[PDB]
From a paper:
Crystals of [name](14–333) enriched with selenomethionine diffracted to good resolution, but most of them exhibited severe anisotropy, were non-isomorphous, and showed translational non-crystallographic symmetry. Attempts to solve the structure by molecular replacement using available glycosyltransferase X-ray structures or selenium SAD phasing failed. Instead, we recorded data at the I23 long-wavelength beamline at Diamond Light Source to reveal the positions of the selenium and sulfur atoms within [name] based on the small anomalous signals present at long wavelengths to obtain an initial model. This model was used as template in a molecular replacement search with a complete 2.21 Å resolution data set that did not exhibit severe diffraction anisotropy. that overlap with a root mean square deviation (RMSD) (Cα of residues 27–328) of 0.91 Å. The structure of apo-[name](14–333) is reported in Fig. 2A. Residues 14–25 are not visible in the electronic density for either chain, nor are amino acids 329–333 of chain B and the last serine residue (Ser-333) of chain A. Residues 27–321 of [name] in the apo and ligand-bound forms overlap with an RMSD of 0.84 Å, whereas residues 322–332 of [name](14–333) are unstructured with an average B factor of 45.5 Å2, compared with the average macromolecule B factor of 33.3 Å2. As suggested by solution NMR spectroscopy, the C-terminal residues are disordered in the unbound [name] structure, with structural reorganization following primary substrate binding, with an open-close catalytic cycle that, as in the case of a number of other glycosyltransferases, is likely to support [name] enzymatic activity. UDP-GlcNAc hydrolysis is not observed with [name](14–333) or in the absence of enzyme, indicating that together, the C-terminal residues Trp-334 and Arg-335 are necessary for [name] functional activity.
Three highly related Salmonella effectors, SseK1, SseK2, and [name], orthologues of the enteropathogenic and enterohemorrhagic Escherichia coli T3SS effector NleB1 (7), translocate via the T3SS into the host cell. Similarly to NleB1 (9, 10), SseK1 and [name] are N-acetylglucosamine (GlcNAc) transferases that modify the TNFR1-associated death domain protein TRADD and inhibit activation of the pro-inflammatory transcription factor NF-κB, as well as necroptotic host cell death. Here we report the structure of the Salmonella arginine N-glycosyltransferase, [name], in its apo and ligand-bound forms. The [name] catalytic core domain (∼250 residues) shows the classic features of the large glycosyltransferase type-A family of enzymes (GT-A) consisting of a single module composed of a central parallel β-sheet core flanked by a number of α-helices.
Numbering used by the authors: 26 to 332
Amino acid sequence: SSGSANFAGVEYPLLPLDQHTPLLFQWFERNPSRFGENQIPIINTQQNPYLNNIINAAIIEKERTIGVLVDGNFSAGQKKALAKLEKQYENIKVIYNSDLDYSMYDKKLSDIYLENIAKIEAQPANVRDEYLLGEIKKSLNEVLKNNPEESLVSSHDKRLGHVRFDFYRNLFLLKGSNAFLEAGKHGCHHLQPGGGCIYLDADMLLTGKLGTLYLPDGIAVHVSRKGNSMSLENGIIAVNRSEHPALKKGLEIMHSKPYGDPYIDGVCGGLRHYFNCSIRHNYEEFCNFIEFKHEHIFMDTSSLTIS
């Protein structure tokens, strides 16, 4: 009726993401002291003009709510600078990650390990992952000895680098438009409960309005191409509704896999299971089917050099 896309002998209707589906940027700062005590604690050099890229997207998309999910040990003056950024740009909403309740998506590590110890033991010995079974029992022992209430959220709260960003990115997108309402952001134009969200990496420059997008079952992700290879990525994630069952599938993998990675399993694994991009299927065909394509999204150029 409004479009249709085919992958692995299954039809997926192209579902619309209206022009008021909010945009999401994410800045988790590990050293806020590198910025001045009265500066917006987002990197903004000429190598990484991330704050400028976020503003330019907010300037282009006037009517659309622009979300910025932040985290870190910011000084009081840095939070006022962020508070003033929300004042200069009416559509910019700064959401602190600590203000959101993710407990409904959480699971105890001891629960995951026990399930897998039972699951692997039921497999005959000639097929059991013997190395993994010992590792899980080892992981369970350390949880019971050091932090028996450790959960996916608490364990990921302690990690460093991208794995903790990627973790909360998937969870925010499951909240979707509700996250802005939960965070108490007033006046978000046409923001509806149950609505979707469009995450964009901060090193990408939006040069024109996205308009209305039409994505298979209302989801699409970035597909990066390096050399002669392509790969599913989380640099762009667009969903047309909250709790999108594909992202929910990625979380379900996190709840059943012993050492689930928020990127490999929460995004790539969830997408491949959801659309049946099996090991025997054409990964290249899936990439073209699921790829977020838009003329007005521009890749970072500062990356580049001779060759």
